[PDB]
Amino acid sequence: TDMNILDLFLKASLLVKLIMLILIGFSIASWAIIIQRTRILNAAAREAEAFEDKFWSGIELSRLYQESQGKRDNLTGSEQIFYSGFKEFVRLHRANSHAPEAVVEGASRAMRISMNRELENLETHIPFLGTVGSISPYIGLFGTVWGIMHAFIALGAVKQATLQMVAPGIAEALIATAIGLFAAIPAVMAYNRLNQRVNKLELNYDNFMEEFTAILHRQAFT
Amino acid sequence: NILDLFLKASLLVKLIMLILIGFSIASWAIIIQRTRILNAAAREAEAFEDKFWSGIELSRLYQESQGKRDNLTGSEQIFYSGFKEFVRLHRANSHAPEAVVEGASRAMRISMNRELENLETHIPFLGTVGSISPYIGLFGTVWGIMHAFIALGAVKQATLQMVAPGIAEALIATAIGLFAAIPAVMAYNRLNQRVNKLELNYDNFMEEFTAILHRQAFTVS
Amino acid sequence: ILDLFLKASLLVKLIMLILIGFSIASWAIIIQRTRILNAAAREAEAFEDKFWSGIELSRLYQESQGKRDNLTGSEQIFYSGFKEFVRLHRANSHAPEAVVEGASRAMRISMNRELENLETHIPFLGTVGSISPYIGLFGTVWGIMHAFIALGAVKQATLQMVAPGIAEALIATAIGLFAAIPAVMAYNRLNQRVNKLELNYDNFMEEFTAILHRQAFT
Amino acid sequence: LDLFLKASLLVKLIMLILIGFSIASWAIIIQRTRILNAAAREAEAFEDKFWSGIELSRLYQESQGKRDNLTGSEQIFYSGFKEFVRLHRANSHAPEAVVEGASRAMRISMNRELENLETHIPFLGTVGSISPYIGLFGTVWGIMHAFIALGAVKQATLQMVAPGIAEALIATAIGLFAAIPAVMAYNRLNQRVNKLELNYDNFMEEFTAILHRQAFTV
Amino acid sequence: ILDLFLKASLLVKLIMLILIGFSIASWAIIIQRTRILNAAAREAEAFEDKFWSGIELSRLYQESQGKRDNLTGSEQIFYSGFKEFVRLHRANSHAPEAVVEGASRAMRISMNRELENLETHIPFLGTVGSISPYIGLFGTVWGIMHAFIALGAVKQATLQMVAPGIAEALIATAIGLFAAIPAVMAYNRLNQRVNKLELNYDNFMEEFTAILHRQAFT
Amino acid sequence: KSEINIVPLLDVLLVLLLIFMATAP
Amino acid sequence: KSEINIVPLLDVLLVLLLIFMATAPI
Amino acid sequence: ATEQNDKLKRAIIISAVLHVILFAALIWSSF
Amino acid sequence: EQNDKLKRAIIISAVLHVILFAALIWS
Known about the structure:
Chain H: The chain crosses the membrane at residues 11-31. The complex is a heterononamer, with five copies of chain A, two copies of chain F and two copies of chain H. By secondary structure, chain A is an all-alpha fold.
């Protein structure tokens, strides 16, 4: 704003020019991750809420297993936690020689991994936001300091140089901090929100894990 | 005065005030509401724990809590789900006492996690405000300083005297950015210490309760 | 000091009175806590000698009754444990297998009560040592606004009209540091004294529990 | 480089220690990252192979067949099974003492694994927290040489204040560069170790539970 | 450089001596503790190499007897546990646990007083690393005030006359950080070495208690 | 735990910065 | 757990002071 | 259950009043 | 013993500071 829209970092030294690229890239990458993860966590929350309804609807569990087998390549969230648990339970229980209770323990670990593998797939790009939201201020400051050191060096042969022939060079060095903070505010603010969404999905899957292992431990004996 | 300069300060400083005031308003509402809640929970925890540890019969203490089954909290809710699944699994046939006490201890564990998650709900937002508020203030001052050096770069005869208010209205965005951050960060640490102390109370109560249930179950053999 | 405080702006009156009012409160807390943390340690060793003298714990509990109203520190851990133990194993003879966790609670609650009586104002020093420098900075920022408003009134600036704004900022920083130094020096010194005295009182947690477990099972 | 050749001796030392801490930090980041990847992969590989339904004593016999460099989830299982089976040889034990003897061995062996993953993480957290303040001390040193030059001659030259400014400004540049590696990686690696601890703690519950059923039935 | 110390106001030269006093005391403590924790760690390694030789404890005990005036660390907690075990195993012994619960108590009463025989001066560094920048800043802020008190009497001012006063004032911040940085690094480093050594002694005393329960119970 | 709190330096810097405003020709 | 990261706020003030200080001889 | 949102609205209102009182006192103290 | 050992540690670190503070004025 209040400066020529056609002129930028382009004329500056190769290092502040490079710092400009990695910082603006971050901001673009940060916003792309915010949109990708916001869509995915909305979809996962909707699919988990729909599945806890379908599961509590009281239709008998072989129907769930036989229909989920009808779409086994596209299972996600609580349906994929259910499927891995019931798959291991029927496989292991099939070996009636098993310890009646020990079937429940084996099935529960089957779901525990399935939960961790789904929950990791929800998380994939979130630790990058915690990186941008912590290094981006300092990368901005380091870009600015290099810009300042390069503004004075560009006049270091002349002492008569008036402040009017370095002030634009100083302003163009502060941009690296302004971009460096502008990439940080969305990143660390969204990193806290998304981590919290992921914990809500973890607690919802852990609720489903208890609900299923309860009706499983019942069905194993009565 | 300050207000007759502030009304003519740049649009960016107006926005940085409304943002930082918004987080100062919000964080103080959380500090009030999440200290009252923790004062209530820490008192309801110890005021149930003695009642349980009085030596009165656990079965009637459970039965008398059925009259408020929809309204339980903290240690009483943690006790209630543990005892409910214990008496159900012990009334049920064909379950050995080590499986009965496991089922009670797990129906306790998940209820205790749900009480702590219901206790701490807004605390992560204080971690946000304490983290971004300094950087929002710093972006406010860096934009102000940069726009001042651009303006200083326009005149034929430069001196700092003609951009002094541009620097001053920049620098205070650091200060109010920092004064909106302080309450949030010190209270985020303090409230996490209070949650951890109250978690250790529930963890201790869960061990003391599962220890008495373990003996109570195996005594029936 | 008073030469400039007499003419300082109204907000500085509050900032100075708050920030020196923390210093005074901090020094008062150091005086109170350094009496207590030193008397609650002496009354620990003056219990341990008597305890290891070989006198019966029955006699200790009996001679403790005549001062239960003021009983404090290590003996108040012991008395609470022994009171509840008697009420569960001797006033009623049932379930010697179950009294030990009762005695463990009865020392646990007395422990938390005694440590809370030591800590009462220690967290406040933790806030003064953390916040006093920022109250200094707020005094500075306000003094700097009084500088820039005096600077904007003249075509060419000089130190002559700026000096009272600078003097205001520096004295607020100096008072903020003067309140912070005692607070953050003493907060760690007292918080270690509490952790030391806690780990001293924890010398019951196995010892008393094993003695009353032996007295229940023998 | 002539601009560094005539730099003040204090700034020479500050450059050597901060470049040293930057180099040591990058070496720790890559070293701990390959180790934590390998340990996380070994845990995932072993715990699958264990839970496959293969007989524990056969698994233990081939695990002893690789007791050389056993470190990982293998070593955790081995320690628990070894004291379980060895303590079981003495039929005088009640089953509670057998699950004690197992969980006694494996909790020790888990801590011996974590302390081999942890080794250089608290150094990196020390560097990342103090490093910008070593930079700041170098900057304040350069600020003094600048003010000394501004106090020398009635109209100081840019050439005579510049050495103080360049030393002051470079000390902030390197103070940032020697803090970037630690501030990204320390929280990431400490979270990685906490996640891998939670993996072994889930193995503690799951393995001691099957041994508890074994002890109550054999 | 002593020229300023020879002329500066009583408070800034007094603050200079306080900060140099903390810096000397800090570096003396860093070299001392480091030598003491190096000795204590090597003495633990040497005792582990003795204990794992397969030597019978009843004759290993006799070895320490030869050095009753120089017992330390791991061998002190071994000796104190075992010198109680012989007694609790002799005559009245109650349960096999009652003889291994009284022996383990006789270890932990020497875990403390080996810790706290090391770990002595570490909390001093914890205060020096906290207050040393504030003492440096208080000397600095007093230095700016002293300069302005001399300056404000003149009808005009310039950098040529105030800058020497500011440059001599900033020394207090520079020395304030130079005394603080070694303290904050070495406090964190040494405190982690104490927690590693405490974990090692706790791992030893728990694992020894498993061999002791094996020999008491079978 | 213990660390280095530097906050009152912001003030020293605000004061030293304002001397240059008070002296620019 | 968490703290104010003061270093970016301090380093911008250091840079602004160094700019003015290098401008004083001009 | 839901009353924690009513308590939060009460907390927002009193927080907003306390800030308006603080800035009113600050602007008055400029005189 | 230990009071003499800490005295020796104070002595050796004091002369280390004296030569450092000499080296600081020497260049």
